[PDB]
């Protein structure tokens, strides 16, 4: 059973916010791809902190931490987010997007091992630079919105060769909003390529006896507007869902 590409209101949300980029959604039960701009969905950009999804799978499978409650030791250096300035476990590091925790954990993993996971995960261009503790923020590794979704579908279906415990823990820590209507798993990331700020929100939402995988990626050239867009990316995603009838 093959997919279908759905048949303008989504592009309007971008236009009214003076942004480019796109929203891409995959309706799992019906096998429908929904694009605000199908050609943008094929363009690879750095994943930034959206990489904390695969990196969390890798940390558990490779035994960097035993589970999501095991704290990693903070080096005592004050950093600019106060929630970062303490020992953190995987659940907290994910929630707070604590780069130091993932950089420290990546030191326990060889570059060739990461390349093995990037192959298993079909993770974009699968490039690891010499910066083997930060290749997801240095523009070496790049991934498209379509590829984010395909990776997330495989995670949901548990198609990768990972243990049951790894999947169970990561699916739980990924939940960042739950109501009686829906369970949302979504992760932000952002960075800059050239003059373009790149703002991601990727994940999947369980709703309506279905699953909707999503990859929102905002392109913003305006310095003055970037902080608002960081605050707006999740609400933009929710607006797209409401426009499509996915949630009320």
TrEMBL record:
Secretion signal: which residues?
A: none
Domain named Penicillin-binding protein transpeptidase is located at: 41-222
This enzyme catalyses:
a beta-lactam + H2O = a substituted beta-amino acid
Source species: Sebaldella termitidis (strain ATCC 33386 / NCTC 11300)
The UniProt entry's GO biological process terms, in alphabetical order, are: antibiotic catabolic process; cell wall organization; response to antibiotic
**Family stated for the protein in its record:** Belongs to the class-D beta-lactamase family.
Gene3D superfamilies, A to Z: DD-peptidase/beta-lactamase superfamily
Where along the chain is the active site annotated?
49
Write the Enzyme Commission number(s) for this entry: 3.5.2.6
- Name positions with the PTM N6-carboxylysine: 52
Presence of the UniProt keyword Cell membrane in the record: no
- This one is known as Beta-lactamase
- Keyword Signal on this protein? yes
Annotated GO molecular function terms are: beta-lactamase activity; penicillin binding
Give, as one word, the top-level EC class.
hydrolase
Q: Which UniProt keywords apply?
A: Antibiotic resistance, Hydrolase, Signal
Gene Ontology terms: cellular component: plasma membrane
